Write a protein that binds this ligand. Structure first.
Ligand SMILES: O=c1ccn([C@@H]2O[C@H](COP(=O)(O)OP(=O)(O)O[C@H]3O[C@H](CO)[C@@H](O)[C@H](O)[C@H]3O)[C@@H](O)[C@H]2O)c(=O)[nH]1
Ligand SMILES: O=c1ccn([C@@H]2O[C@H](COP(=O)(O)OP(=O)(O)O[C@H]3O[C@H](CO)[C@@H](O)[C@H](O)[C@H]3O)[C@@H](O)[C@H]2O)c(=O)[nH]1
Ligand SMILES: O=c1ccn([C@@H]2O[C@H](COP(=O)(O)OP(=O)(O)O[C@H]3O[C@H](CO)[C@@H](O)[C@H](O)[C@H]3O)[C@@H](O)[C@H]2O)c(=O)[nH]1
Ligand SMILES: O=c1ccn([C@@H]2O[C@H](COP(=O)(O)OP(=O)(O)O[C@H]3O[C@H](CO)[C@@H](O)[C@H](O)[C@H]3O)[C@@H](O)[C@H]2O)c(=O)[nH]1
Lengths: 289, 289, 289, 289
């Protein structure tokens, strides 16, 4: 089956970004012209996923609801669930067990921003994979900060380690994952790691050992914009601004993607444009159709 | 009397910045490494004002309270009051009548960012003025968007117009004002303009006609950053970021300002820095003391 | 035949960028960590093109030769020729007539900077096209400034205009072109335009009217960094720096491309690294092998 | 005597910046909208110095002369001299001995960028000093990279060390110095240091030991931009671009300075702005007068 459910994990207290995140959720922070979460949301929409569960903190979930509603305005079906404590990426599947049901599901971090050509085809295999899991590898300068995947000479991925002190490679596993239905029980069966979290890397290693993990390489022609510091956030906004102003197009605009993939029509677009017409956003949509 | 009370007017629905202000008050949005509200707050602190009333919309006032508390952590006394409808800048003095009492009071807009090494000195005269008012002029190339002050050959302020279609000068009257106690009665007597607002420019014209208006000039050593569009927000964040890292200092950091003006001591700075120490905002403070 | 010759047109006086370009040729200006010309040179190398003619002004041509030499150090064959006066892009084929001989040839502008995922594949049809020409269309905000290609409902390119006052579309024809051997005679018979230049757009319209022009779409996932203003130059440098620092990889590094495509071996790279080892460039190459 | 002569030391091979300095003199590289040399040149002009000697390498000197000419277009008198080998900053006084004659003279490095609203007043004292020397200190986080000046409790300069492994303070002695006529003979008596150069710090230590040294402090309102690496160059260009755009001015624009200090008149400004009018550098000047 094609993966048609997705979860955006957008919780966390954001201590690493204080004081900016003392009174605004990290995933609501603007990346130039739109909140951060519009980017990973766009990534799921580009993969054809329209049924999505958003997980956030007790305090932030209602702000995401206020921003997005049930998503029907974009031809989506959005649901929300609260994560009491940030216990690890894998907890997303426990919290989302009912939402997932017996289907396949993708997980994307609310702060995962991708930009690049052919992202839909980069994700196509993952979306259509019969069983197992797919993750994406990206070369970074500081592998120690991420889940790291090692490849042998044939170029086959043969190991995964979470924040290794001596990375076996410079390839980090990104915040976009595709899983089959077995991930739910797999997650419920995990024990906390040394840092007290249900590790996504433990989930991935299981799939790998059973030969069910596909590691899709995301080439250097793609940008995976970091959002870990005040500096990286402003560099992400400038990057997106440089692209949009030059092209006269927006990057990860849900309304545009919904329209282009026919989740909604021109008429619906014109309505959505109304409340946004005081700036380039609403005008952009009207000009579009 | 030295002006020792101040009001930060930080209401508004933020429609102009949608969708980034759909779930977030514009004044909580970050300008590089701190919430926008830290900027006008620092401006008042730099004038020696420690008793401050923050006004916002019903919905947003509690978020400002959660972010700032009563201000005692920085040696300030912050109180809060709500503005049900944005009836105009001058309504700040009606809502703040009880807070003001019989004292002089300054008003700063919550979305105004003032920068300038000599600003404290420039505000000194305004703080000490015995009666009347002081406003701050800044050269812009789009005067038609603001209150505009015209000067005669001698250099005396001769007229004030709110968004003149044919500006008489290129000097905008910025959102920082120091008034004597009579502004409250002036405000309570104003009638709404054509746009249905109690205008700050009408208040300023009254002081001008009584011969009690001083105009402080902010020359090219100053910056008054635009926060009106997605584009101006990133331009403002870029400005703060480049100046802080190239000049090795922090712009409008209340903890630093409170410490430097002795509102708080080194022990308190370290205590405040703890929760903020995962990034340079907190580490800078620890190094400072 | 596969296109195996290329021309980099890097002349012009650069008046648009004065006074920066009174002091340095535009194509020698740094785009973060390397001279601008390294970018279009990398593009040709990525297409497998190693036999290249560099055209510049009488004053600058020796500068490029000083920088690049004959390119043998990177397994290329670089030659130089002077363009007495900037009489138009098409003059490149007259100046390069002897160099081109009877072969196919690509033309890239010395200030053309592309960044994106599958560039080699995007150019593959062009490199292998039997006869005719191939150009690349990119969506921009200001088509008026470029050669514009209009598409009909079916998506077929139906017209080409050079800087139309009323663009028939928002697709600009970039500075990368692939031609068969017939372009030389077209160029020799072209009459100057209203502005007194031999227009590349007239050459392209000739191919188009013969039904021999392919228009390869460069999606919004690619960046075509503008280099026309002081502002666009720093946005380009920041864009590249953002990508490189995050990845720990360089964009358009000729030594790396030469090495990866086996134009040179590791031993060769070590020698090239020597004179560059005082900064990350030299160190990067050493680390690479 | 008022200091009326200045020397800009602009040699060196700039190997740390390869490959961008392979075919371009480092001081001809742009810092946003004008060549690097314009900055230290403006620093001298702001001190009222109009008789200037530019010293560079045998390959680069002619390029500066090509760009700047005799400086008469800006009411200056510029002359040039070649430094055969980079034997040290202090060699400037030997090479420039004939130029200096019996007068006082300032020395500024060709790659130092000084910014600050009060710099002119700050330099006024130095220009008027009857005898002795004035140097400029600036706080840095990496004092070990520069000449370092230590102050006692009183605030008196008590030691000077060139690149100390154990810095005695964090105040760097920047690349701007004002000397009386005794500096020439001091230079003739210097012996090369361990690194084989005539050190400016030995000269300054002599003045210090004779109790004839003044140290001007550049505090928070100043910026002293690093131009040593590819990264610092873009950081410096970002600083200039942001300050210029946000504050509506030009940093170190010789035409503007020449006009404002009455070195040239409005007609000459327009004439000079013509060739520069395709962009804002020229348009700003036209608007200025
Ligand atoms: O104790 C925790 C841990 C994470 N989070 C949140 O979950 C998201 C994950 O971010 P982060 O903690 O910085 O990622 P890491 O936990 O360091 O790494 C995970 O996410 C990386 C990027 O997606 C993967 O490379 C790693 O393999 C995976 O373990 C964020 O928005 C966090 O706020 C919390 O709230 N609390
Ligand atoms: O009743 C009100 C009116 C305004 N605001 C806020 O105040 C700021 C002011 O913005 P805006 O209303 O759009 O500015 P204008 O009212 O058009 O202009 C005012 O602010 C300018 C400087 O920013 C001055 O030059 C003008 O003279 C003055 O009238 C915003 O964040 C508003 O939301 C409130 O909170 N309540
Ligand atoms: O005789 C010439 C003409 C141009 N150039 C250089 O080529 C580049 C092109 O810039 P410019 O001359 O300003 O562009 P245009 O010639 O106005 O336009 C051309 O380049 C555009 C994309 O850059 C295309 O869209 C247009 O169709 C094509 O005609 C610059 O670095 C020029 O200096 C030369 O070296 N020699
Ligand atoms: O004989 C020489 C020596 C240097 N330079 C140039 O002068 C600048 C100085 O650069 P560099 O030699 O690398 O700096 P240092 O000599 O290490 O440091 C000097 O410059 C610093 C400020 O930039 C001061 O703090 C130090 O005290 C002073 O010794 C460069 O553009 C050089 O190419 C010359 O043109 N000729």
């Amino acid at each position: 089956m094609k993966t048609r459910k997705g979860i955006i994990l957008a919780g966390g207290s954001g201590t690493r970004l204080y004081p900016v995140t003392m009174a605004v959720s990290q995933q609501l922070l603007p990346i130039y012209d739109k909140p951060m979460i519009y980017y990973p949301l766009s990534t799921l929409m580009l993969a054809g996923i329209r049924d999505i569960l958003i997980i956030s903190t007790p305090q932030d979930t209602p702000r995401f609801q206020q921003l997005l509603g049930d998503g029907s305005q974009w031809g989506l079906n959005l649901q929300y669930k609260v994560q009491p404590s940030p216990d690890g990426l894998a907890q997303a599947f426990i919290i989302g067990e009912e939402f997932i049901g017996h289907d396949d599901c993708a997980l994307v971090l609310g702060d995962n921003i991708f930009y690049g050509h052919d992202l839909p085809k980069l994700m196509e295999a993952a979306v259509n994979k019969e069983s197992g899991a797919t993750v994406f590898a990206y070369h970074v300068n500081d592998p120690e900060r991420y889940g790291v995947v090692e490849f042998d000479q044939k170029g086959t991925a043969v190991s995964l380690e979470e924040k290794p002190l001596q990375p076996k490679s410079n390839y980090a596993v990104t915040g976009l994952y595709f899983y089959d239905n077995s991930v739910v029980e797999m997650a419920k069966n995990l024990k906390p790691s040394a840092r007290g979290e249900l590790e996504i890397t433990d989930i991935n290693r299981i799939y790998m050992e059973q030969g069910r993990l596909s590691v899709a390489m995301m080439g250097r022609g793609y940008a995976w914009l970091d959002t870990g510091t005040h500096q990286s956030l402003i560099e992400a906004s400038n990057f997106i601004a440089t692209i949009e102003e030059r092209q006269g197009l927006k990057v990860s605009c849900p309304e545009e993607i919904a329209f282009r993939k026919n989740f909604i029509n021109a008429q619906q677009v014109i309505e959505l444009a109304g409340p946004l017409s005081k700036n380039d956003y609403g005008k952009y949509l009207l000009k579009m159709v």
